[PDB]
Amino acid sequence: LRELLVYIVFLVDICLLTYGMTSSSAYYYTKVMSELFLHTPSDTGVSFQAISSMADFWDFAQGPLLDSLYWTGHGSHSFIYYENMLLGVPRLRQLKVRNDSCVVHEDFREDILSCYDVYSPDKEEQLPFGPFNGTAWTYHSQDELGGFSHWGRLTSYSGGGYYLDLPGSRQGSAEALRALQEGLWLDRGTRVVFIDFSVYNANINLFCVLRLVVEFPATGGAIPSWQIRTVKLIRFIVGCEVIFCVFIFYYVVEEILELHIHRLRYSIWNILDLVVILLSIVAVGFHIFRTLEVNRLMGKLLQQPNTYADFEFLAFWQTQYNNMNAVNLFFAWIKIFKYFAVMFFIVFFAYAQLGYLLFGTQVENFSTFIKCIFTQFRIILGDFDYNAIDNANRILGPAYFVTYVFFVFFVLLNMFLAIIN
Amino acid sequence: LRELLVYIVFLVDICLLTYGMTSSSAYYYTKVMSELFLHTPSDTGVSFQAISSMADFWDFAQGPLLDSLYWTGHGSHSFIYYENMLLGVPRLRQLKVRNDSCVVHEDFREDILSCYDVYSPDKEEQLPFGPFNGTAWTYHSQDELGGFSHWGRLTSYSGGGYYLDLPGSRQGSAEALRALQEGLWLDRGTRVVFIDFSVYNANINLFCVLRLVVEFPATGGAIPSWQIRTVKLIRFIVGCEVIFCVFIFYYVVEEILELHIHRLRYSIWNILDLVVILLSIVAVGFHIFRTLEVNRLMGKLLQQPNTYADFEFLAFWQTQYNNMNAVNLFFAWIKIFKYFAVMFFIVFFAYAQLGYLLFGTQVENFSTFIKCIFTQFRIILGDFDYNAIDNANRILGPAYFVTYVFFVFFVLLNMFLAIIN
Amino acid sequence: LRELLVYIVFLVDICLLTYGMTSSSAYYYTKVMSELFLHTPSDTGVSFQAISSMADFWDFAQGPLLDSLYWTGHGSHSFIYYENMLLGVPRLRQLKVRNDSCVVHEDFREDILSCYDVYSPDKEEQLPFGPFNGTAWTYHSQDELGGFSHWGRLTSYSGGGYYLDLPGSRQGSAEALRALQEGLWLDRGTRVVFIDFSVYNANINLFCVLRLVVEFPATGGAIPSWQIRTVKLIRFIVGCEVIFCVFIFYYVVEEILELHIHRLRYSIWNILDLVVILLSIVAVGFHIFRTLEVNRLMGKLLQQPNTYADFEFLAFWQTQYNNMNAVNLFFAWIKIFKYFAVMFFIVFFAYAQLGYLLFGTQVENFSTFIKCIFTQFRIILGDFDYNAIDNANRILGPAYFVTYVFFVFFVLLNMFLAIIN
Amino acid sequence: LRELLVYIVFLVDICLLTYGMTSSSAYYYTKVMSELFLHTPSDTGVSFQAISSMADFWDFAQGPLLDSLYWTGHGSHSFIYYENMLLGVPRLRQLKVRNDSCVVHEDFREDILSCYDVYSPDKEEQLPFGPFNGTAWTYHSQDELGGFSHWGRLTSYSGGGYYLDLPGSRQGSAEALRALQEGLWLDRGTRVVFIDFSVYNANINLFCVLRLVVEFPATGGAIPSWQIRTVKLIRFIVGCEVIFCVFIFYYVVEEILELHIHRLRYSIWNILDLVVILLSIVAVGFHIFRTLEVNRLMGKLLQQPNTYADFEFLAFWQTQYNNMNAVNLFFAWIKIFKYFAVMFFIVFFAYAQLGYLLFGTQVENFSTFIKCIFTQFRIILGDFDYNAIDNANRILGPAYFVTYVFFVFFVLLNMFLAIIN
Ligand SMILES: *[C@@H]1O[C@H](CO)[C@@H](O)[C@H](O)[C@H]1NC(C)=O
Ligand SMILES: *[C@@H]1O[C@H](CO)[C@@H](O)[C@H](O)[C@H]1NC(C)=O
Ligand SMILES: *[C@@H]1O[C@H](CO)[C@@H](O)[C@H](O)[C@H]1NC(C)=O
Ligand SMILES: *[C@@H]1O[C@H](CO)[C@@H](O)[C@H](O)[C@H]1NC(C)=O
């Protein structure tokens, strides 16, 4: 039709555009790259998904990441598999928090005088502490480095300081970090230690970026997380987009001509048009930023080759970019169709609240309030761990469980008997 | 309204009161604290969740709890992570049972003369047995120590004797326990060995208590259990409670004025009022007991610092306290609404009884009668282990299973056909 | 009533009789006893649930069963935990099969001349093969030993020969089995090697028996199985039974007086009476056999203490005895109520047959025809392993799976629409 | 009947024919054979299901496959268990791809000059590269070897070159492969390395074949797969088939006599006849090919015993043969009965597409488009891994999950309310 088949042409263009850079050879690259640094055992046998102390972080960052980064085809650019190059050098930016962040209660004094705190956008340390200026002991601002607010497991973070751009040799990084041990760069009151680098292979034209987080909470310990993102970086790779750039102006006019002479009563198909139109401009804006930044970053590197080229910013934005391409593509696929629970939610969150207060600690599920909707929703499906509800209190755990399951069955049965006719 | 909005004000006060001490930074403290002592391997590789013998308990209590408690910021109060202090010293109270507890049957004599027994509140040993008075070999009563009845995995316990308050140094505790080996303090007929201590950090104001149970049943072996509880201990932290203290007297009067001139016919909303009123007085009584006992326990410790300050009593009562706050909070959330199976249960417990007698041993599920309701109820949901029903007898296991599942489907189908109209 | 309340008295007597010997302290004894021999690692690290070769069976039977049986309270009767005695000595009976059991096909000769076979009640070796008479190299009949037909994993067995009653000392059993290695007692064509012994504790009066099977199939390898059974052995322990003996004669008369003057038309409540009556005589017959055999077996042992007292026979019959007590108890509990699929089964077994022929090997589920009803029934519930259906052929696996699940949903939906009214 | 009972006779003949060679002793042979080479640890502890690097492939192929193939009843034909012979010798055929396969983009030059590629039927290396002619360094065509197109995990393959027929001794294969290391036969740009051999036992007359794939993708790493197939090879074993050969001509005539004088309107029972008739000729053709090829392969081996007898071709065709026997047997069992979703699929594949683009990498499920129908169909059943949807992005993962599950429940509920009457 003159109005429907145009949208199919718009579909197949926006389909072929999203799949334009959809390497079908990416998730095995994520396998090799994830399970080369994460799951590798050390000499004493510590891996990144199973780090919890602090003295073994300095075994992880000297055995399975220093003896797992520097190979010597092979030249001097440190191909990590022999099939993908290390571009730039990693860096280790550390947040800290300060001693008088909050005050201890007066029952405990005289021994417990220094009182660190949970991380907030306030309460950091904008102060140097080490022996002499070496960049790794001096704070640097949020806009001297430009790194966006990382989102870890507990709370968000910022563009913190104390970073150390690594050298590019096996003996060099060991003589850096071993001399960094006795300085105690990881002192008592750290909140996150990052380590960031990235690698690129020729064979399928994919940049993969690797962010490795070792966060030391206020309670103690270490609860690690990783973030491996693998996308195209680059892109006849460009001519399919100039027909896609037409459709934004093609559809905003057909929207506003209905909106210009609109009546005083405007359905959800209008916002269905709007949510897929507004994401398109955000998508097409990112290409210019990529073509500036990727070129700037390799221009920064072919002279002065020992420097951290920051790929994490446009890596995160490229990842949210093709996430947004997936989401507006899905909205386009749903747009092809253009041809009581009040007594349930307030008790649903009540059982969630009961599960959060009973099962506070002792379970790493049920542990914030949101996760007490996701767990308590998975229980409606059938994924549950009763051997850690019954291993928590032994009296109210099963008492919660049996009557919650009977409540779910009662409320799923009650609605249908009067709605069947 | 004048009767409904007051209850919302009562809700938001009782909500903010329960969340007054709801550290959102507690379950990672339970992670670090649990997985620092439980899951730590020894030199020969024994962990607390995987202890079963008796000669390896004395490797667990000399490698991963003696080389995992005494670190040397750092002073002399034994910060276990470098971020949480060891307050007091642990202790090791041991129950025992006596030789003539029950008599062997007459077919077996002449070799099997000593006959220990399952644990009961009777049948203990109120007798010293070691070389000389050192507190670890002499019984102490239930009210010389004051410890409540612990509830282990098999049956309850009492405030038993034989305890050993540990010293506060690395060489000292090793010279204690190594000299305690050749005395054979853990002899043949023990029923529980406890070890209790607790740690507190400044950074978020939480007391976590740790009770570690190694119980040696009448059959032999060891089947360990732990109990880690982590709560506030302390608490402008107090002024939100004086408005909450008003509402008890506010609502008991409005209950009894209906009850004073009551008719001769009193619904379940009355006991709905009663169950949330009666828990409130029990809740507000605990604060005075905390403010006495926490102060007494740190008064006991700043002079004579080498002593066990008993936190387990008010720790258990604080834990049942905020459990009760969760339960009456849930009853308040359910109280916002104030604006045939006879041929199924007797066969349900019959299949439970059949499963208990067929699957007696060989499965650590199905193993008491209650657990044959919880397992045989989980089978209605979908969590089951058919590779240990079929690995038990191979003939009646599947015969039980298939016809029980067909019975559940038949009785879940039969009720709906006549109730649909 | 005069007919109903008598049955309740019969219930409570038959309930208290079955629970007369229902040690509530048995499944932890099965835990300690199972996980003391099964899951124990060797020096080179082989456990009984993970044995598959033949040269490591002789590490399992020299490290974690010879250094895990002989401890030196402690006398000379080999308490294995220090809390349960080793009564008698173990023995190792071996079946074999003969060289000309079946003939190879004529394409393969000249190299493959000896042709052993799958086990049958025929085709054994009633022949000695070792150097000299020592009982371990000479066949013994099915009625020289009296052992019942064991049922292993593949097929049944018989009372085979070649057994070796072990000595009762640490050096003695090692000098037995090490001298038994170079004789090659486990030669190429074995089908089962057993090892049987049993242990008894005073503390709760339970005999546990342990049968450990290492079967070498015709294909090769070893696919082990165990059989641990733990029951009373013994039994004021006897006077509750003389009232139970009354009810057999009480109810057979009331059955036959209805059957003597019966009409020419006899419902399933009659066979409901019969199945619970006929099991009662079988139950009460076993007590006399226990009181003879248990007494005979300890009479065999207090003189000549170095001999295998065969507990496995009445152990198996005691286990099927209290299984039958569970089953007729369940029938009594179901008897308190005395106050199209033709187009589904033939395709059900057809999909079972398709799954057996597609998924023949490569999966240890789906592997006989029966197990292709149990697996293909578990798929209706939700326990399935799609990562070994898709890891078998990759083309017909999912093709079987998706349309079988759609068939199950179609046939579970089709029956209800016409049966709702 | 004269038309129905003939088909039952045809059933029981075609049943007994398919089960004619249905070794009930095959899946334990697959257990021993799979878990003898796959799951065996090396000296440094690498197994075949857990190989990912390249320098540890040369530990897998020198410890747990060179010290796990050559045993020294025992003669000189290398019985691998002592109960199944090694017939022939293994071989190691390697595919490669060439340097100028695709060109790098112009932003990256001067360092990244060699650019290998994903595997295709084009782009190989038909060129020798090693020092001198030894067969292992020279390409051989697809029809010099005759090996069919293997189907690995990523994409299909072909009959590639570079193979090395192994010798038949322990010292010989080690002196082959250790001298093959310094030549670097596994160089940077390999795509698959195969290793193929097969073993046969006398005891139940089964040939099992073993294909072991170590594929090095374009990204790097190694993602291994295996293929173990175990069938009869041979077959009074032949006389049951001459009655089965009658039924093809018996039923094609009864089909075409209906088809010769057929009306101008031909139901799906006709193609139901056709799909079970046409597979029968394909089945009966394979027997002649087996009787030629099995005889040729053992004729190739009794003289010149050090050669690879290719069993993989007729092994794959025998496996698809008894797969086809299972499928037409199932169609025969279904043939005994001869006596809106348009708004669901386009959003079903839309959610699949959203899951493929969100969950591209980071999950080895959800990873191609097809697997986003199999996973997103398993979610309707209940097998899902929410701890890798929530561990992927943390924002859209649960947002996808909750509304997809609510969509599935809404569309499964909506169809029944109007179809109930
Ligand atoms: C941090 O603590 C140290 C003592 O350990 C103290 O000297 C210093 O002044 C404190 N600095 C801040 C910013 O709290
Ligand atoms: C306990 O047993 C010992 C022998 O081991 C005996 O000497 C002692 O009297 C017994 N004591 C009790 C209280 O049973
Ligand atoms: C078994 O095989 C051996 C050769 O290994 C042969 O000497 C002996 O006669 C055979 N015995 C039987 C009973 O098959
Ligand atoms: C492969 O690369 C090498 C350099 O490593 C080069 O000398 C050779 O000519 C290339 N051959 C092909 C076929 O690309």
Numbering used by the authors:
A (entry chain C), B (entry chain A), C (entry chain B), D (entry chain D): 101 to 172, 181 to 343, 351 to 381, 384 to 456, 480 to 561
Q: What do the authors report?
A:
The overall architecture conforms to that of other TRP channels, and in particular to the TRPP polycystin-2 structures. As characteristic of group 2 TRP channels (TRPPs and TRPMLs), polycystin 2-l1 has a long S1-S2 extracellular loop, termed the polycystin mucolipin domain (PMD). In contrast to the 3 or 4 observed glycans in polycystin-2's polycystin mucolipin domain (PMD), polycystin 2-l1’s PMD has one clear glycan density located at residue N207. Polycystin 2-l1’s S3 is a near-continuous helix extending from the membrane-spanning region into a pocket created by the PMD. Finally, a disulfide bond is present between residues C210-C223 in the PMD, similar to several polycystin-2 structures. The S6 helix of polycystin 2-l1 remains α-helical throughout its length, whereas the S6 helix of polycystin-2 is broken by a middle π-helix element, before continuing to the C terminus. The key filter residues of polycystin 2-l1 are L521, G522 and D523, in which the carbonyls of L521 and G522 point to the central pore axis. The narrowest apertures in the selectivity filter, measured by HOLE, have radii of 2.6 and 2.8 Å at L521 and G522 respectively. These distances represent a larger opening than that in any of the three polycystin-2 structures (1.0 to 1.4 Å). The relatively larger size of polycystin 2-l1’s pore radius (2.6–2.8 Å) may enable partially hydrated calcium’s transit, thus avoiding the larger energy required for pore residues to dehydrate calcium.
